[PDB]
Design an enzyme around this catalytic site. Structure first.
Site, mmCIF file in Angstrom:
data_model
loop_
_atom_site.group_PDB
_atom_site.id
_atom_site.type_symbol
_atom_site.label_atom_id
_atom_site.label_comp_id
_atom_site.label_asym_id
_atom_site.label_seq_id
_atom_site.Cartn_x
_atom_site.Cartn_y
_atom_site.Cartn_z
ATOM 1 N N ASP A 129 -2.090 7.536 10.319
ATOM 2 C CA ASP A 129 -1.583 6.170 10.410
ATOM 3 C C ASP A 129 -0.616 6.017 11.583
ATOM 4 O O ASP A 129 -0.669 5.025 12.322
ATOM 5 C CB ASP A 129 -0.943 5.776 9.083
ATOM 6 C CG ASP A 129 -1.992 5.496 8.017
ATOM 7 O OD1 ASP A 129 -2.868 4.651 8.275
ATOM 8 O OD2 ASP A 129 -1.980 6.152 6.959
ATOM 9 N N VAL B 99 2.154 2.758 13.049
ATOM 10 C CA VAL B 99 2.580 2.103 11.809
ATOM 11 C C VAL B 99 3.574 0.982 12.079
ATOM 12 O O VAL B 99 3.687 0.044 11.277
ATOM 13 C CB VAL B 99 3.164 3.116 10.802
ATOM 14 C CG1 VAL B 99 2.142 4.185 10.477
ATOM 15 C CG2 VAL B 99 4.474 3.706 11.320
ATOM 16 N N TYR C 41 -3.682 0.922 2.251
ATOM 17 C CA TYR C 41 -2.422 1.576 1.941
ATOM 18 C C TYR C 41 -1.191 0.845 2.481
ATOM 19 O O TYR C 41 -1.162 0.250 3.556
ATOM 20 C CB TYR C 41 -2.347 3.054 2.412
ATOM 21 C CG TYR C 41 -2.910 3.970 1.368
ATOM 22 C CD1 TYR C 41 -3.951 4.882 1.610
ATOM 23 C CD2 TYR C 41 -2.379 3.894 0.080
ATOM 24 C CE1 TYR C 41 -4.440 5.718 0.570
ATOM 25 C CE2 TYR C 41 -2.824 4.692 -0.984
ATOM 26 C CZ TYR C 41 -3.867 5.614 -0.713
ATOM 27 O OH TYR C 41 -4.318 6.421 -1.746
HETATM 28 O O1 LIG Z 1 -5.003 3.669 7.224
HETATM 29 C C1 LIG Z 1 -5.936 3.610 8.272
HETATM 30 C C2 LIG Z 1 -7.346 3.574 7.682
HETATM 31 C C3 LIG Z 1 -7.835 2.156 7.373
HETATM 32 C C4 LIG Z 1 -7.731 1.141 8.316
HETATM 33 C C5 LIG Z 1 -8.191 -0.136 8.020
HETATM 34 C C6 LIG Z 1 -8.768 -0.405 6.784
HETATM 35 C C7 LIG Z 1 -8.865 0.611 5.844
HETATM 36 C C8 LIG Z 1 -8.402 1.886 6.135
HETATM 37 CU CU LIG Z 2 -2.894 8.640 -2.368
#
Ligand SMILES: O=CCc1ccccc1
Ligand SMILES: [Cu+2]
Ligand SMILES: O=CCc1ccccc1
Ligand SMILES: [Cu+2]
Ligand code: NA
Ligand code: NA
Ligand code: NA
Ligand code: NA
Lengths: 620, 620
Positions: free
Chosen positions: B290, B296, B374
Site C-alpha cells: 500500500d 497511502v 482496506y
Molecule cells: O490495497 C491495494 C489493493 C487494492 C486496490 C484497489 C482496490 C482493491 C484492492
Molecule cells: Cu487482514
C-alpha cells in the site's frame, strides 16, 4: 435474591455469631480468611444456601481450623483441625505486620547489628516478608516471617530509599522468638531521600496541563441491579468480591438476539507471585504470593473520584471480615464506568460511495490494591465487539537493596549506593469456561508454513493447524510467539450458521514465564508459573493454582496435583489457567516512584457469532 | 521559517511551473509522486533550500523520469530518465484504477467469461491490483496491472460480497492491451449481500448507548506554531506529511530541565505489504504494498469531528499534488488531541502515611487512509513518562473469494459460498535515531537463566546480557519472546548521573514475520519483512526498505542491498528498521465489515533520565 450477590454486613455478623456460639471464636482466635462459597453445579433447584468458608488462626499455638458455615440455616457445616506442617500455614495476618519489627527491637543480636551501623532502633522499619520453605528444619510446622530493614529518617520519610543491606532475621510469630539473625557485613545505607512529594525533588509543579472533562449528561449506559448485577451493551454479568482474589466476575454472558449466551462462568486472578533473582543470602529466599499469602482483596484502596477513577463512576463498596469477625466496608473499593475506545469499524468504499464510521467503547471494572511497597490495579474490560480483556497495572515503589561496589549481575542501580534486585511479577488467571454452555474443549492453534513445490508453486501459501487437548496430562502448554500460537475454547455441540463450532480465541502477550531453576523451591511452590497454559476438568475444590494454603507449603500443591488425575477435557466442564507476567529489570526512571507498566491477555470471539456483532451500533 | 514546515499550495504550484517551463510536463505526462526532501545533515548553515522530488510518468510509452527541483531558486536540480525493466515501475496512478475495468469491458475473452456466468458487464467491478514479478517474460519493462472481478447488484451494493472466482486478467495499461485472461472454472458467485447499512442486515439500531462527552474547557495543553510544530508536556516535534509515507514525525525531543534533548530525528512507516497465502493461481500472485505501490498518503480521509476524532481536536490539512501538478488540500486529514490515559503512578505507604496518585495522558497524532477494500488508522502516541508508541488500526472489508466445496486449508468461510483468503499485514517502521545526538548504538538484550549451583545455591538467580551490534552485516536480528528479547538504542558518549549511557528500549509485539517460502518472489521483494529488526548507517538516499520503485521490481532492492556495505554502526548516525505485522485468519465476525484489530510497538526510556521524569506532574 441472587446467589451471587455481594456478602452483606449482616451475613458476616451472623457468621461471627455462629462461630462464637460453636466455641470456635475465643479470644485466642483470629479469622485469617473469610469468603462466600460459590453455588454448586446444578443450582437449578432454587435452594438458597449462603455458605461461608473461614480459616481460623490460633495465637496461642493451638492448631488452626478450616470451617464452613451456612448463614441461611445458622449452622456449622464442617470444622477440620489443620496440621500445618503437612498442608501449609494460614495466610499472613495484617496484625502480624507490626509484630516482626517489635520482636526484633528487643533482640540483642538485632540491636548489636543496628548499633554497629549507628542506626537508631526507633527509626528502623522492618518489612514482614513471607518465609517460603528452604533448608531450615526447625521451621517446619512453625509460623515464620522474615524481616528486612529500612531506615525512616523522619515519620513521613520514604523508608524504601534507605535499605539496610547485609542483614536479615527470621521470627516465629506465635512463640515470639527470633530464631536467626544473619549479618553478612556492613553496607552503607543509601543516603539520598526518595520523597516524591518533596518540592526539592519534584521541582516546581507543571502549570501547563489543562483539564480534560469527561461527563455523561444522560448518565451511563449500564444498569446495576441487585447490588452487583451489570447489564451493558448486550453484556450481562455479576461482579463479586473475595478477600483473597479481589474482584471476581461471574456469569459473563452476551445477549445475541433473543438468547442469553454464556461465555465465562467465573473469571478471577487466582494467584500472583513476585520471585526475586538476587542470589545474595539476604534476599535469595524472597518470593511473595500477594494473593495466596497476603490476600490482595483485604488491602483494596478506597478510590477517589477524579483521581483514581475519572468520568461518570458507579462504585461498589464490598464488605469483608476483620480478624475478629466484625464486618468492615471498603468504601468505594470498586470503580465501574464506560470509556470511549476510538474507532470500532470504518470504511469508505470506492464503488458504492458509502462512507461509514462507528465508535468503540468498553466497560471497565477495576480495583487497586496496596501490599507494602507495591501497588497494583486490576482492570477487566468488556468491549462492544465481544472482546474480553484483563490488564494488570503495576506501580508503587520498587523493592530496594544496596548497590554493591563493583556492580552486580542481578541488581540494577537506581541512585548512588541504591540498588533494585531483578524480579518478576507473575499472575494466574483462572477462567472457568462456559462457551455457549459447559460442554467445552481447548484447541491449540499454530501457524503452518508451507514449502514451495507442487500445489504451492509460487511458494506463497501458509495455513494453520489445530490440536485438540483431550486429557489433562497433555493440557500443559507453552507459548510459541514465532508460530503465532493461540488457544481456542470452543463448544463442539453448538454451531454457528456455517456449521462450525462456536469459539473464543485466547491471545497471550507471550512474556517469559518463571525464570528460576526448575530444581528450586520457588519452581516447586509456584509450578503454575513455569507454563503458559493449563486446562483442568472443573471440580468444586480445585480453586487456586497453588492450593488452599500457600504460606510455607513445601511444594507441589495445586495444578501439578490436579492434572495428575488425567481427566477427560474433550467436550467437558473445563477450566483454563493462564500464566502471564512481567520480567522487571528496574530502570532509573522507576525511581523514586514507578510509572505504571502493564501486562494482560484478551479473548476474542472466533466464529461465536454468525457475523459481526456490532452491526446495530448507531452512528453517534 | 522552519525547513520542516508542511508543503504549501504555492510551493506545489511553483513546482508545476518549473517543470512545465523545463519541458517536463507536457500533456502526456503525469506526476506519480511529489514530495519535499528533508534537509541534508549539517543544515546548521541556515541556507533555506526547499527541494522537491518528482516521479513523472508518460502515458504514451516514453521513459519516465525522476526529477529534483528547488522551489526556492526556481531551478531543475537534476532529471534522470528511468529504465523501468532495471529499476522498477512508478507507483500506481489513481486514474489507472478505472482503466483496468474499462479495458476488460471490450475484450472478447473477458466478455465470454462473464457471459458464461450470466453476469452483466455493466455490473462487474474490477479491482486494479499490482502485478508483482512472476514467470511472465513479456511483462518485463511493461506497466502491468492484474484484475479480479466483483459484482455490484446495484449502485450502492457492496461488491466485496460477490467475488467472481476462477477468473483473472492481466492488462498493459500503457499500450492498452489485455495480455492474458485466465479462466480456471465456474464458481457460483456468492449471493448474500454484505450491506452493513441495510436495516434488514443490521436489525433495529441500539437505543441503549448514552453519550460520552469529552471536552477541554480551557482548551488543549499543546501549542501549534509555524503550522506544524508541536510543544506538549515537555515534548517538541514537527508533524510532516508525505504522499507516500503519510504522517512523518521530525525532531522528536524532550525538554529535560534546561536542555532540549533529541530522541528521534525522523519516524515514519516506510513500507507496508499485504501478502496472500492462497495457492490458487487466481490469487497466488497477490501482494500489494500500500505504501510503496499505491502511496497511502494520497488516500487519506477527511476526518469528521465527533465520529473519527472525539474531543478537543486540532486539525492539519496537508497539501499534495494531483497528477497534473495542481495543489490539492486534504481537509482535516490529520487529527491531533490529548487523551486521558488512566493512572500514571500510585502508592499508599504503610509507614509514611502518604497517599499519592497521579493521572497519565497521551498526545495523539493520527490519520486514516483507504485503499480499495482496506482502511488503516495510523496513530502516534507521546506519553508523559517519555514513552513513544505507534499503533496501526486495521479495519475495512476483508478481500474475498469463493469458498470451495469441500473446504480449504488457505481460505476461511465467512458466509455461504463466500471465502476470505489468509493473508498478513506487515509494516516497516523507519526510526532515524538521535538519542541525545547522533552518536548511537544498538544492543540486543536477552534474559539469562542461571543454573542452580555455587554462587546460586537456591537456584533463584537470573540475569540479562547485552550484545552490541557493531556492523551492518550482524545487525539483522530476529525476535525471541521466550528470552524476553528487546533492543536498546543508546548514546555511548552521553551518560546519566550514574555514569551509564542514556538509552531507549524498543519493545516489540513479537508477531510472526513473513510466512512465504524464502524462495518466493514476495520474499525477495519484501525481504525486510523476513526479519524483525535491521540497523543501517544513515545515508541520504536510503529511504525505503524496499527501494524507491517497488512496483514490478524484481527483488533485492532496499535493505538487503544497503547492509551489504557492512558499515560501522557502533556509535554512529544510525537508522533502526522494525518489522511488525498481523497474521490474519479471517473470522466470521470480520464480515461484512471488520472490527478494528491493532498492532504496533513502543519505545521506553532506559536510563535516559536521572530519575522518573514525571515527578513534577500536579495532583489534578
Ligand atoms: O490495497 C491495494 C489493493 C487494492 C486496490 C484497489 C482496490 C482493491 C484492492
Ligand atoms: Cu487482514
Ligand atoms: O507484597 C508482600 C511483601 C511485603 C509486605 C509488606 C511490606 C513489604 C513487602
Ligand atoms: Cu517490578
Ligand atoms: Na508438607
Ligand atoms: Na467450565
Ligand atoms: Na530488474
Ligand atoms: Na540517526
Amino acid at each position: 435474591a441472587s446467589p451471587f450477590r455481594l456478602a452483606s454486613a449482616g451475613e458476616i455478623s451472623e457468621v461471627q455469631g455462629i462461630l462464637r456460639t460453636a466455641g470456635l471464636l475465643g479470644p485466642e482466635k483470629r479469622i485469617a480468611y473469610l469468603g462466600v462459597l460459590d453455588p454448586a453445579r446444578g443450582a437449578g433447584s432454587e435452594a438458597e444456601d449462603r455458605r461461608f468458608r473461614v480459616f481460623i488462626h490460633d495465637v496461642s499455638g493451638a492448631r488452626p481450623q478450616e470451617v464452613t458455615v451456612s448463614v441461611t440455616n445458622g449452622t456449622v457445616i464442617s470444622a477440620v483441625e489443620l496440621d500445618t506442617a503437612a498442608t501449609g500455614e494460614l495466610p499472613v495476618l495484617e496484625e502480624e505486620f507490626e509484630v516482626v519489627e517489635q520482636l526484633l527491637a528487643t533482640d540483642e543480636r538485632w540491636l548489636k547489628a543496628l548499633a554497629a551501623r549507628n542506626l537508631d532502633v526507633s527509626k528502623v522499619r522492618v518489612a514482614p516478608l513471607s518465609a517460603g520453605v528452604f533448608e531450615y528444619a526447625e521451621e517446619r510446622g512453625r509460623r515464620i516471617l522474615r524481616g528486612l530493614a529500612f531506615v525512616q529518617d523522619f515519620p513521613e520519610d520514604s523508608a524504601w530509599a534507605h535499605p539496610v543491606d547485609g542483614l536479615v532475621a527470621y521470627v516465629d510469630v506465635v512463640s515470639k522468638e527470633v530464631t536467626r539473625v544473619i549479618d553478612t557485613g556492613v553496607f552503607p545505607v543509601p543516603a539520598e531521600h526518595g520523597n516524591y512529594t518533596d518540592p526539592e525533588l519534584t521541582g516546581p509543579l507543571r502549570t501547563t496541563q489543562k483539564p480534560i472533562s469527561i461527563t455523561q449528561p444522560e448518565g451511563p449506559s449500564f444498569t446495576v441491579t441487585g447490588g452487583n448485577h451489570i447489564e451493558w451493551e448486550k453484556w450481562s454479568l455479576d461482579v463479586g468480591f473475595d478477600v483473597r482474589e479481589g474482584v471476581v466476575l461471574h456469569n459473563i454472558a452476551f445477549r445475541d438476539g433473543d438468547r442469553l449466551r454464556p461465555i465465562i462462568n467465573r473469571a478471577s486472578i487466582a494467584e500472583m507471585v513476585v520471585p526475586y533473582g538476587d542470589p545474595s543470602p539476604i534476599r535469595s529466599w524472597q518470593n511473595y504470593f500477594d494473593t495466596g499469602e497476603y490476600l490482595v482483596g483485604q488491602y483494596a484502596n478506597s478510590l477517589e473520584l477524579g483521581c483514581d477513577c475519572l468520568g461518570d463512576i458507579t462504585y461498589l463498596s464490598p464488605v469483608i471480615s476483620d480478624a475478629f469477625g466484625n464486618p468492615r466496608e471498603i468504601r468505594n473499593g470498586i470503580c465501574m464506568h464506560e470509556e470511549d475506545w476510538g474507532i470500532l469499524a470504518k470504511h469508505s468504499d470506492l464503488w458504492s460511495g458509502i462512507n461509514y464510521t462507528r465508535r468503540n467503547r468498553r466497560m471497565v471494572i477495576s480495583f487497586f490494591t496496596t501490599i507494602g511497597n507495591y501497588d497494583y490495579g486490576f482492570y477487566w474490560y468488556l468491549y462492544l465487539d465481544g472482546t474480553i480483556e484483563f490488564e494488570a497495572k503495576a506501580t508503587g515503589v520498587v523493592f530496594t537493596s544496596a548497590f554493591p561496589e563493583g556492580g552486580s549481575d542481578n541488581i540494577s542501580q537506581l541512585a548512588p549506593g541504591l540498588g533494585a534486585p531483578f524480579h518478576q511479577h507473575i499472575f494466574s488467571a483462572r477462567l472457568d469456561m462456559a462457551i455457549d454452555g459447559f460442554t467445552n474443549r481447548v484447541e491449540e492453534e499454530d501457524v503452518v508454513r508451507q514449502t514451495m513445490g507442487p500445489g504451492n508453486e509460487r511458494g506463497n501459501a501458509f495455513s494453520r493447524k489445530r490440536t485438540v487437548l483431550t486429557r489433562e496430562s497433555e493440557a500443559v502448554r507453552e507459548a510459541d510467539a514465532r508460530t503465532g500460537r493461540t488457544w481456542i475454547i470452543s463448544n463442539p455441540e453448538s454451531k454457528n450458521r456455517l456449521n462450525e463450532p462456536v469459539g473464543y480465541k485466547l491471545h497471550a502477550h507471550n512474556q517469559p514465564t518463571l525464570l528460576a531453576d526448575p530444581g528450586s523451591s520457588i519452581a516447586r511452590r509456584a509450578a503454575f508459573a513455569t507454563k503458559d497454559l493449563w486446562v483442568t476438568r472443573y471440580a468444586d475444590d480445585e480453586r487456586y493454582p497453588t492450593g488452599d494454603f500457600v504460606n510455607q507449603h513445601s511444594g507441589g500443591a495445586g495444578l501439578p496435583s490436579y492434572i495428575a488425575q488425567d481427566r477427560d477435557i474433550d467436550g467437558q466442564d473445563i477450566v483454563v489457567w493462564h500464566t502471564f507476567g512481567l520480567t522487571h529489570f528496574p530502570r532509573v526512571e522507576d525511581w523514586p516512584i514507578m510509572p505504571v507498566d502493564t501486562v494482560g491477555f484478551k479473548l476474542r470471539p472466533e466464529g461465536f457469532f454468525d457475523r459481526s456483532p456490532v452491526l446495530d451500533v448507531p452512528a453517534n
